């Protein structure tokens with residue numbers, strides 16, 4: 489209704505979680521190097537129990553239940 | 567500055583503090599506010615919670631527990647200001663919680679006291695609303711969990 | 724709550740006897756190991772992480788003395804008063820904010836199981852379990868009232884946010900029921916149940932995961 493983002497657009501920390509998914513989905517699952525850097529920056533700025541880290545860990549665990557079906561692709565593989 | 571958020575739209579509150587600190591880098595700014603949108607642009611260490619007592623007497627002003635520099639406005643509203651994201655004084659805001667109990671009442675299948683509610687929600691919020699998506703997800707979870715219970719009963723017994 | 728097994732006593736507890744000296748005589752730090760290990764560093768009333776924690780006498784020595792120095796009337800509760808603040812939840816709110824409550828009418832997580840007493844919904848609110856009638860239901864309502872499980876926003880909103888984060892995971896995990904076999908799917912369920920063990924809200928996520 490008000491065309492206002494949930495997080496302020498003028499702060500680098502606001503786009504950190506969006507970037508986490510875009511860099512999780514860049515390697516299609518599997519926290520790599522660039523993704524794991526983003527994850528401790530989120531864990532340091534935001535608390536150990538925050539919506540940001542709780543949602544970060546969800547994206548991890550969900551592209552770990554889907555990479556299992558693609559490691560199930562390793563089971564029907566060739 | 568007293569009530570920095572006065573006469574400001576939320577979009578302006580999203581950037582007023584940043585603009586002030588950018589234009590006046592070396593000014594010590596001591597401001598008061600009561601809007602979470604302004605607080606979303608301020609570090610946790612810069613915030614002092616003023617909760618007095620019945621005498622107006624506070625001894626030490628405290629900082630919030632959670633960081634408020636990149637957090638969403640609703641999170642700051644509910645965690646720092648103790649304000650519900652949804653209006654507690656409206657029956658429509660409890661429809662998805664009432665509906666969830668009604669699915670779970672009859673084990674998780676839309677019955678009738680749950681279909682009157684699902685289309686009360688569909689008519690009010692709409693097809694593309696978040697509330698209808700949550701209701702559909704809850705329906706799917708209830709059905710899948712029932713099928714689970716059947717499968718685990720087959721495996722166990 | 725979760726069922727938290729009151730294990731052995733701590734030893735310091737015997738050196739201090741209720742009536743002869745005030746509870747302040749013993750150090751809460753010594754009672755913490757047993758309580759903390761029992762609760763895995765979380766609240767015994769609202770599952771709040773022990774970041775803000777205090778030894779709570781379930782039966783206030785001032786109203787039910789309940790042998791103040793009995794390890795059993797001692798719980799690894801939440802919040803704290805020496806550091807000041809505006810705590811209106813769980814143990815601190817039980818002693819002062821709630822008022823006019825019966826100690827025996829409150830569920831004790833040590834012996835009473837909150838699984839069949841409390842139901843945690845997806846919306847973050849706690850309701851009495853389904854099918855409760857008469858006396859049994861009234862303990863659930865009473866404990867929700869006095870412990871302020873539904874109450875101060877900082878707990879309800881945080882629990883709801885925690886549950887909403889994992890809901891897409893529950894969705895996708897239950898979508899592949901037919902894609903995987905029984906053993907593998909139960910293994911995924913066990914993996915999720917391990918995940919919620921090292922999580923802030925033990926039982927809300929458990930209720931959102933299994934039923």
Ligand SMILES: [Zn+2]
Pocket residue numbers: 766767768769770771800801802812813814
């Ligand atoms: Zn607590």
